[PDB]
């Protein structure tokens, strides 16, 4: 039942990506803006069986789609999501400007920033922890170098195509 | 027997030689492996790890695309290390082995063709590319590799 994943209304933020446990309908469609698979071919997926099939979904900025790939780097890859160096699956994404774009801005979706250590593959960090700072203790915004560790996107009805929101789903196979 | 065992150069595994004719081999301690399961001798060079593939029933790159023995084989297999003759300080790349083919070989079959291997879906008209590989590859021998990566000389008798 992929319709529950590819046709839902509510999606999650990148810092708190959602995981689910479970093909011609996918690769015959033309709406998808990006479709890339690693380690296997989409046309041969019907000729194999696996024990595990995981589905992960979230929303990120259009310019950051390239970061969802093995061996990439950047804020999202360093602190929000991370794929192994020997990943096996597919990455799907499409534009969602008709949704998640309200006059004046949404400010609903967040992304982590200023983390101190890079994430390991397939893990999430949700707890709000002490603010990244320099040598002086901080428990608010009392430090001029003190900063809250989360930020919000500014999706609006009019913006450059690079700043529009995109829905992304990642499929993984393992036996 | 002296000519086959004491020759100066051996053929590549993908181009093994044939020979027909019409004491020292048994007692000599130089033969690391000596096990016996019209006479035709053979000779080639391979890595020490692949010596186990030359036997009735084994599978692998050497047994599938380069040399194959029948299940009802009647003969003996002899092999010895030759690191001090087939290695070089700068590395030797004069030996080759096949790496891609459409189907496995039959017993005592030899293949010398050098056509382009058409991987993928789109065909290629004899021009190598990103999806059309050259089927032959080269070995790398140096005087400092592990015993499993040193060259070995093999002779297999068939009666």
């Amino acid at each position, epitope marked *: 039942p992929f319709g529950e994943v590819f046709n839902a209304t509510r999606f999650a933020s990148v810092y708190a990506w959602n995981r689910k446990r479970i093909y011609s309908v996918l690769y015959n469609s033309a709406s998808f803006s990006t479709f890339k698979c*690693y380690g296997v071919s989409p046309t*041969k997926l019907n000729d194999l069986c696996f024990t595990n099939v995981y589905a992960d979904s979230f929303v990120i900025r259009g310019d950051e789609v390239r970061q969802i790939a093995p061996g990439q780097t950047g804020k999202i890859a360093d602190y929000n999501y991370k794929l192994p*160096d020997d990943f096996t699956g597919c990455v799907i994404a499409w534009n969602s400007n008709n949704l998640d774009s309200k006059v004046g801005g949404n400010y609903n979706y967040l992304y982590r920033l200023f983390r101190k250590s890079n994430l390991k593959p397939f893990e999430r960090d949700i707890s709000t922890e002490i603010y990244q700072a320099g040598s002086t203790p901080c428990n608010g915004v009392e430090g001029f170098n003190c900063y809250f560790p989360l930020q919000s996107y500014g999706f609006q009805p009019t913006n450059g195509v690079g700043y529009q929101p995109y829905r992304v789903v990642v499929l993984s196979f393992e036996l | 027997f002296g000519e086959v065992f004491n020759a100066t150069r051996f053929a590549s595994v993908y181009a093994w030689n044939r020979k027909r004719i019409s004491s020292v081999l048994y007692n000599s301690a130089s033969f690391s492996t000596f096990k016996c399961y019209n006479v035709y001798a053979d000779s080639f060079v391979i890595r020490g790890d692949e010596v186990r593939q030359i036997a009735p029933g084994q599978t692998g790159k050497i047994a599938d695309y380069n040399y194959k023995l029948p299940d009802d084989f009647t003969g003996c297999v002899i092999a010895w290390n030759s690191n001090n003759l087939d290695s070089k300080v700068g590395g030797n790349y004069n030996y080759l082995y096949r790496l891609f083919r459409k189907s496995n070989l039959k017993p005592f079959e030899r293949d010398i063709s050098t056509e382009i291997y058409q991987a993928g879906s789109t065909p290629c008209n004899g021009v190598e*590319g990103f999806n059309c590989y050259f089927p032959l590859q080269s070995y790398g021998f140096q005087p400092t590799n*592990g015993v499993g990566y040193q060259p070995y000389r093999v002779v297999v008798l068939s009666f």
Partner: antibody
Amino acid sequence: VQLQQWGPGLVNPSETLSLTCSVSGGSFATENYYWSWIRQHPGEGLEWIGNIYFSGNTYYNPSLNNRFTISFDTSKNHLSLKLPSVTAADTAVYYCARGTIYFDRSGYRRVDPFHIWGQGTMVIVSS
Amino acid sequence: DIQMTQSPSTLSASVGDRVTITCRASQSISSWLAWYQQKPGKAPKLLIYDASSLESGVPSRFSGSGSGTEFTLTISSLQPDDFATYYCQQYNSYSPWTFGQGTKVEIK
């Protein structure tokens, strides 16, 4: 990830050249990546030497008379370049890079351009 | 087999001006082209790929377009750090890969 290179700076006008490149923070054993060697003559454009893939496959540039050689060393996880009988026209900078391989929706196999580069190495032919 | 041609060989401009560069191919290629920048005495870096896709971390003032046999690189507003050498490279699947001749930019 970072790539480092090791090589000789001087070479006789008739000898064998040997260079080595390595990686840190990752591994060579992966069917997702490929490696290549680029060179640049002083005050000139770039030239592509060839590519090496996981499983030992290789692909060379036909323009060159297959003088070069590329191979792995799994005992050390290195990649090296070999060129015997060097000459005067072999003075240049040498680079090692990496790329990515993926499958398309239609089922074909495509490639991405280089995105990781080494620091380069300079070599001169003495006399 | 396949070959390129860049023009102009050298270009002079000033801060805030518009700059365009053209890479031409001998035979049609299905958008398999990329652009590189190289500072003096440093390793190159990738800016554009697929003739139209922007690389992560590069400024938004860079853009590229074209397909088949003509491609163009455009800079909306030159900054003091944009003076360097640029190269176009193609990675077609039926022929060996090759680089362009390169073009140089300096202050007028």
